[model samples]
Target chain A: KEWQENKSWNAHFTEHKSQGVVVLWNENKQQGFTNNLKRANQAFLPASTFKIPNSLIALDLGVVKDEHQVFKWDGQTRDIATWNRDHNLITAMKYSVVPVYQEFARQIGEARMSKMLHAFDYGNEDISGNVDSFWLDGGIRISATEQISFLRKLYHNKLHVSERSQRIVKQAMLTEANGDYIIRAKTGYSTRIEPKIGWWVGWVELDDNVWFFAMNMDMPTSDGLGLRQAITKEVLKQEKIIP
Target chain B: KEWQENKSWNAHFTEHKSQGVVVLWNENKQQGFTNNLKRANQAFLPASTFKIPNSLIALDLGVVKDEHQVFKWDGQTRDIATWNRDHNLITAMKYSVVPVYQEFARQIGEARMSKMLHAFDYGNEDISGNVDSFWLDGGIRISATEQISFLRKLYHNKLHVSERSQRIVKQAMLTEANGDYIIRAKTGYSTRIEPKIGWWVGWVELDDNVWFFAMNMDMPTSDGLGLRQAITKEVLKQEKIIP
Candidate 1:
């Protein structure tokens, strides 16, 4: 069943000169349409996608007062231009600023972080290295399938966290909104890994249903980062989930 | 996986002195825990559970103005004492009044009924015997798994029908409500079949998740009718889904 459903998606990965997997889950139908089932289950560093949960943990523990709470820039220039500016929780999430969330993690600390991850049943639940860098490169890892499961729980407000915390994080994750649909997502790029891995994970709310997707592909070079969201959006369009 | 999840449920059916199957699907987790996998997929007459879709079709076509529209009872008394009185949509659904919905089917007619069922992707899409009796004893049949799928769509308001119609029918199906959880469901009995088959299908909204369930059991005698709800509630309690 997966092979048949995935046949048409082969060209998208081939065009990018990278191998990857995508998992599209329809919440109402309780069905998943996917490509590369094995890789979809294979774990990889979550990168910035961990911010989804990180934001929740910060809010739940009162590390950040609310989405409007601002973090001042340290005056040190960063590689990404967006990181040079002061940011609030929503803007930090929108810009995927590492320092902002690193501050959040430092405040949360290892003990409460581990406790929260265990309660959430998050992938691996291994935060063995530095608390600030674990999700990015230290030790924590999660699969595309597990990403969908976690996102589904967050979407339904069924995670172990409080509803207000989930709602604020969900709003922070909003990446796109238009007349037809709304997308809440995060993009992750892990440059420290040997081959590197790029990720786009989130859920789309259309007419009356919510569709979740998680895609991760090998990033042999910096150029391959574009394939993460590119392949996912094209598939969503092909499935007629988005226009 | 299923056997392990179902091991504790055997005593429930044994205590009732009947063989049955129950499929409980966690919508957020996209997981189904069931007692009998084969029978869960096996098709059987839907009985009065058809009133769910029947009510939807009637409302979509404006056959009835709204849920408050009352249907007057004929002077003749019916076998079920409750059916002898006039009923609005809520009361009709509450009592599982067959004659009320039979009248709804007659107004909907064969042409529109078939079209609506096809649009809903409802089980079998067969309304062969008579306009009013097809779901009761005619050709139409549905599996417990399919019932969950259909109910899930309705729960999310993703069915082909209008949202207004689905919402009205969903409200009519409300069987229980309290501080803990709310249950929206329908019961069915097919005495026309030789051994008789009893059904209880619905979804439970507790906390932040919705759990769907469909159960059917052998009704060797009228005494076995109570097992439908009895077995279901016991399994639900055992699973800690209901208090």
Candidate 2:
């Protein structure tokens, strides 16, 4: 009777108010560990995740100026073997190649990256601004909860500072991939940020999907789902958020 | 917050408690006449509502004795001119004629109708049986809550009877029409039920347009979608329930 009276799925969250349990737990009891503590962040380096923000940084900083303003690859970002492959910030954001995200970061410069990181609210124990290097030998860490919070507020259609900058960030997340779930996610991985931590993040459904929002990926290795999007499928099934 | 805190929609009923609204609303608010009263009960006379159930009764009771079991129509009793043009229960009930329902009342011999009604938890001010003549003269009422409860239980494969009986009842609800919403509905008219009442009741959830085990029609005279269906739609929207 007690369980029937008070054990609704929602009440379970209130039961564990202060205690920590993996949010979307499975039968095996594996926890979706978070890298950022009180700072509420993830330690996963920004390979793909960096794409949206860097695009924002570039647009806000007025470098690469126009999204239609194409730039020759210069072939330096990727291996000489694949050097001929060219890209602008738009294409780079979709495919989520670290080289593109970083090239824009390099062009936009550290001053802007630092500013946008704080703008998106990135800080904390795992991600103190002094962290190591990421794609350009500069390592960075971020969290899913923070990713959702950042994306949601952005989705409310206000950056307060500039809707143009927010729109640029959002447009950067759009892609033509066949994800079972609607999203403009970026994927990434690196030995840093705990070896295998990979990330796939973005907004969806003209921003409706973000309401059931949060980051999803394999921890430590950050190596699940891939662009194949099996993780998104399973999450949608569990949430009954989508077919 | 204030707007959200106390908003109400169609087909609704409430009983305040010290705790809060203590809502019993269903995603398909028509299950209880909207108003976020999914768990309340209504006892309005079946009038037109009984057509569906009356058909079910004929099927399950098997007391019709024959396919064309001809009971001399009585507009006041057998309801020939006052009700259906057909002789058999199926055609009669399909047309929402009073004679068919009265036919079931006679063949089921009143004992069975009384038993099933009680077993189905049909009572209160909405539904009743006097074993007398006054009710037959058009006296019986049902609230949106009781109606949904009866329909939901019928859909549940029955909490009061056999699965075969449940299927028979459900199939009886859909006599004609095919569309996006399931068509299990009946319409009623009685100037006395609500001083001026006209009822169109049925369940519809076909194709992609999710509908409800709902009543849609007129009251007194100009009957159709009014406060009821509007309230039902509002609840579905809030719950984000889909087809």
Candidate 3:
């Protein structure tokens, strides 16, 4: 392979350098874009991508009964506009609302939450620090490959969490749906981490099969969070996994 | 032509693509460490590096007679320990004592400072915002290349300010020295800017020749402020620019 065809999504990672991508498709087959193959298997803090399993944990553990439960603001302003207000599970999930999920994790408690994470065999299953933020900066780590594996299990309805939990998480992750495929994913930006990186993890589901993908890119700033979606969707398009 | 040797300095930038570095030596020669060549050329708010020139402006405008003049603390608590106490010019520059410089800028007045910036050919020559706060984020901008140029002028005693003013600035910039060489530099961190960045701009003077450098790196948090010195010194060592 003397010459690799350039794709917009691939070029983004090569250009940014501190970036990696993993795509798993047709069962047991995976592709790593450019020079980040090893990095694709390296672990990093899951950041807001933890919200995927966190939402399920909150749902399964009865922290909140449904998506309609409102999380009231603590009367303090946050950097993001959407995070400043009260939110239900849907809006919180949509916005990656930190305070809301933090409240959920606090209610979930360290013991029960660690049990849930362990049961799912999620990453290193280490929730050793502050209950509200163990999934941020240095608290928990998951590689892009691990992300694909976790999402694949969830897609197969085989994760240790309840089928109902998996079903609802799958529903919540539905970012787009069309005739060809239903794209489901969670985007994460580690705004607190040094040099702040971003993650886009989940899968695209077609009639009979699915493609699970995980990507991490340098975000530089919170403003660059949109790069997660832009690069991810472009990769999916290049792979013909999405239209 | 295609075989480009990778340097450790470049590995740092490649590994942390959010970072950038600009190194200028001699009048006509310059080096862009890795992927940030354009960024090195493109202007950004000068942040606390403005203090370098602001200090000189104060001396030139008779805001403070000399570096030894005492600046009384207003008794308001600041985030940095070194910044809280009363400071003379050298200590003020060493601590990046913001309040001291804020007082200096205030006394110098906007009109006079604007004139000084123009005479020095400072970045974009903009002082449009609050006199105390401009040059922090949006009010003024300077590229690393431009930084080297300005410092070069100051280093060569070619700026419009009096020789005494330049002498005091060069004296105040002294951070470390020995018999063979003296390193004079200023480190700046823009805490207000999102996805914070740092600037380490100045030169090392030896018996034979002087080497000037301008370095900026991504600081996602205040913690990475040390990287300015760490990376710069490493580059100097690797380049044999410093011992």
Candidate 4:
């Protein structure tokens, strides 16, 4: 696959008007790049996808104190009265606990919250009262440009977060089907829809080199299992590192 | 005495919490530094204090077209339908036209707005956020420390705006007694609370260096008219020029 521009694999911008799919495969650089630039703005509830950054926040501020520090399974009652658990930031992040994450967001405060996000040069997609805003409501908007840049920053270890924080992120997103690859992936399934769709924003690493990836599947709004399988299968195949 | 710090001033920290009241006489050097160390986090509604930076936004972006270009009673609904006349940026600064100022805020957008404000180093204050949320819910918590440093940057002409922007601000703030003193000022009133409040944020040329000042007043809730008037009158008197 040592390719030239005239080969069939090379893509041009003239075709994809409404749908933006741009992929770059570099041999010397190892892996490749692909994106759904249009789908970047299609609104989807963040669900647990936001936990990655939240965990990063806790790490940067020393707000959560210790990673190994454990809290008793302090499960709180939601409206549905489902039992909840109070673990450390990582566990809470992995499971996507609302009460736990909500509390963290509140504690993040406006000014403190702004400092972390601003450090990454990430501006919220919407207007906020100030730096400490909930970042909820409509939440932050990230385009393909933002997503790619953020992932690249993470790959370069430029996020200004602790080393443990980075390792935790990598550990959390490790996938089995992909070979010799280290990835940091967070998934979001929006329940607000009639059915539901899931999305992912993260990066993949091979040895010391890494590439960012963002993928989403929009369904008619139902249980998200089918959508998840669909997206994950396609994503793995595109890398060709897995069948 | 027109000064940055008065020997007689002292605040109850327990009651004031994070707020510090900085009374600095010379902005370019030590006096301003002393003010920052002593008085930080003394909170105030940003109000038209925001307009100072927003005006710079307009100028730097070339949105103003011309700084000296006068605004009249456009008679259009002002920020909240306040005035009925065409207004230039200079006169708009003088009149404190919220509508025109809001337009400037829009031009700056959230990313640039936060970037410029942060570059100024607002003591402990921050300004990055959703550009949209700022005007509706009010924007920025700016304290006395920030107000002083903010003006010091303006007085030193260190901002990323046309020179005339500062000159316009200097001229717009020209009151009957402030001539002969090189001062750049923007006074503000906010109806967000009852009885309202008057704000003065600016700096002056004294002894070949600049000195920043801000007079934040809320009657009944604060020390009242006596203190406010005393401080304003104190500001008008010329100080000995530094060699």
Candidate 5:
């Protein structure tokens, strides 16, 4: 089967003391490997990972200038130290600043945002809650499977948005690049939900292949925050995707 | 008309003492600007600009491993001093090393090369001449307008080839990037024919738009070699595509 459960990944989740679902897709082969098939199909709040499409929509609509456009600090302190200062599109993406993107969402508004999400075929295309916080705490939700689909389109520049806009967002999503491979991704954590849900979604570019992965696990405590990336990386390493 | 001639650009060609065609395509608006519409439709040998599609076909077929894969020097010194040493895809592209790509063409062979070019809808898709030297001195020819169409597909990742291959080629094509815009391009000069045609072709990525330009001029001497980009840049400056 193209979609098969990978029993080997269970140990990593067990070590993290969390239950999660992971979907690893090989773009060229059009095959998928996952730890839990059922859970992979289950949707959850997107949390900050929504920043990917949010940034795309913002750029396509000219809601933000380029990646260098700065969003002024409102002179308000926040829980995350990085959020307390001004940030440009790149910095805001790197820091995952909630308020900065909230400002972008506010500017993007509902009609255009909804339209873009539909165009992207993202998740269920639901944005029923407050326009600014739908993906963070409201009705917007996506499965690990759906995330892989959306990410594959973005990777191939097959998304409905402009290619330049997609490229800008991809640049901002770049988390790591080394001699062997490049990783572009985003992490998300939803605190409003019971037993908070965490997410790690992105793709890796290797010499011979491109791999897309999405993982979401139950976060019982704040300490599990690190597990989002930790589990994904371990599996990636096990698969020999990175050195 | 979207394809109307701009009298302002005539002085540029006149200053260089060359008669040629220029096609500037605004991708989003689907509009075109040019100096000579008649010449824009006239087909000419693509010269080294064929390297763009050539690289894509090679990558897709795994002829070269990746951009970082090094091609060993045959120890044969060439006219271009830069080609004397080992070169990778990126450096070879920057230097426009003809021997390196000719070697690549030898490996690509006639059947696959013809197949891929037809798939790319490249020019007249005629590989009637020798396999390795076809694009340079063979029957294949493309117009500035046709070059724009091919470039547009490439820029949007809409080419029949894989997106990864497209991206790798695009990365190799990166010529200039600054605060305001990024330019990805290739230059081609054909010494096999009378008048020695020259080409400057690629796209500019701006904050709000993407502009694609292709220029081919009569290069009577090596002194006119620089005019390909000079005329294109001048036209781009006049269009306010760059600072």
Candidate 6:
């Protein structure tokens, strides 16, 4: 039934040939495998992926205390049932609580937001319109390759943020931690564009080594969150990164 | 400098994207990598690549006794410099002597050619237009993937042809052979088709393994014969199959 093959890659790439994909693999010092070059020529919204960096900026500026800081919901029901209650930094990052991070962007303000983005050389650096939702439907855009470069800096603790902020953000993204490896990642579903696609960007750690990845694809179905994770795992499996 | 990262692939992909391209790869048993599926969804003229199987049919039918049998130049000055000479099987395949193969096709007769093509499942097997030029300007055509499949069968000596014929053709196709591996390939330039592209189809024999590949690309320049081989060899080098 091609279930095995489908598990690893988009079997119908031609069906969605307009989509661009780039997967970059690098170690501490090695000639990594870049799947292609042209796929990086365009950019899309960072969506919730900005949370990774946003968490750092928020913590760095004391806008948020730590991963345990809580933000209470204003008694509003979201389409997602999980977002109706209070969420700490860890839960907000995990669930991708939109209102929670919107609050973070607001408290951080345009001055510090612009400063941090420019310092880190973030994409476009134009937080015009509204600081609370700039990365949402805002003018900022970044390609998958650009996402990898940013993640590489975060992996090496080379971003302008403090080491503790980087370490805390890394820990907050811990999606899985088995004996051999740890996978820290974030999935972003952006409904603001046509060919509605999503993002799954982060890294894996094994044997004291880390490899970052940024992947996005056309989301044809209402439930595309699984598709995002499925595609990334397939690539990692193809490269023998995971069991 | 990122000298090592400039790489053997992706460089040529961008160089030729404006000019369409299709490359297909197949190892003996594994699921091979196809660069673009949609790019080869349709068929194009076999152009000169038909020389591979055409050579086989001529030999199997006793039309040409062996590689040494010569087809005199007929004192005709052709467009290509090397084709003006009398060519045997070896030289004809090397220099792509079009007139020699045309003569062989005429001698083979329409009935025999149609039967042979059907037997081999060669392309559409429609040689009705003109036996001499069917594969040139007539209806004969084959996709790059189809070329790889046919080449794969020939590589394994399972093409319903005599083993000796296969060996002779493989030997004739030997572009280079060092201590480690031997690369045997044929290039096709479809001057008869629009958005004219070229073909480089054949196999590589290492110590114990063989990989078959077929590649075609749009040829806007008068000089496209070299582009096909250059791109194919670049792919082989990136994969480390050739030095």
Instruction: Give the TM-score of each candidate.
Output: 0.51, 0.38, 0.47, 0.40, 0.56, 0.47
Q: Evaluated with TM-score, which candidate comes out highest?
A: 5
- Between candidates 3 and 4, the one scoring higher on lDDT is 3
Quality class of the docking in candidate 3, CAPRI style? incorrect
lDDT tens per residue, model 2, A1-243: 000111122233233231111122111222332222322243445545655666665777777665445566664655433334565555555445555455665676666566667666752212334322343235455555556555556665444335556655554554421213334455555445444444555543411123223343434423333422444434444456455
- Runs off by more than 4 Å, candidate 1: A1-5, B1-243
Give the per-residue lDDT digits (tens) of candidate 6, residues B1-243: 001122335567777553444454546355555566655545889889999989888887888887667788899886888888777887788778889999889888888888888877887878857788888888887887778778877776677777667766875675654345556888888877575778888877653357777778878766656767777777778778778
* TM-score attained by model 2: 0.38
Error of 4 at B135 (Å): 68
lDDT string, candidate 5, A1-243, tens digits: 267898889999888787998789987788999999999999889999999999999999999878767788999987888788878886787789989889889999999999999999999999999988988778888999999999988987889888778878987786765346667899888888665888999998764578999999988777888888888999989988786
Encode model 1's per-residue lDDT on B154-231: one tens digit a residue.
987788887778877876776765446667899999888655889999998764478899999988776777788889
Better of 2 and 3 by TM-score: 3
3 versus 5: better lDDT goes to? 5
What are the chain B TM-scores of all models? 0.96, 0.62, 0.91, 0.69, 0.97, 0.90
Model 5 docking tier (incorrect/acceptable/medium/high)? incorrect
lDDT of 1 by residue, A168-219 (tens): 7876776765446667899988887554888999998764478999999888
lDDT of each: 0.84, 0.45, 0.75, 0.52, 0.86, 0.73
Ranking the candidates on lDDT from highest down gives 5, 1, 3, 6, 4, 2
Please report, as a residue range, the 10-residue window in candidate 6 chain A with the lowest summed lDDT.
A1-10
C-alpha root-mean-square deviation, candidate 1: 22.3
DockQ for all candidate structures vs. native: 0.01, 0.01, 0.01, 0.01, 0.04, 0.01
Single out the weakest 10-residue window by summed lDDT for candidate 5 chain A: A174-183
Winning candidate number (DockQ): 5
Q: In candidate 5, residue B40 scores what lDDT?
A: 87
Please list the residue runs of candidate 5 whose C-alpha ends up more than 4 Å from where it truly belongs after superposition. Answer: A1-243
lDDT of 3 by residue, A149-203 (tens): 7887887778876666666676567565433565678888877766577888887
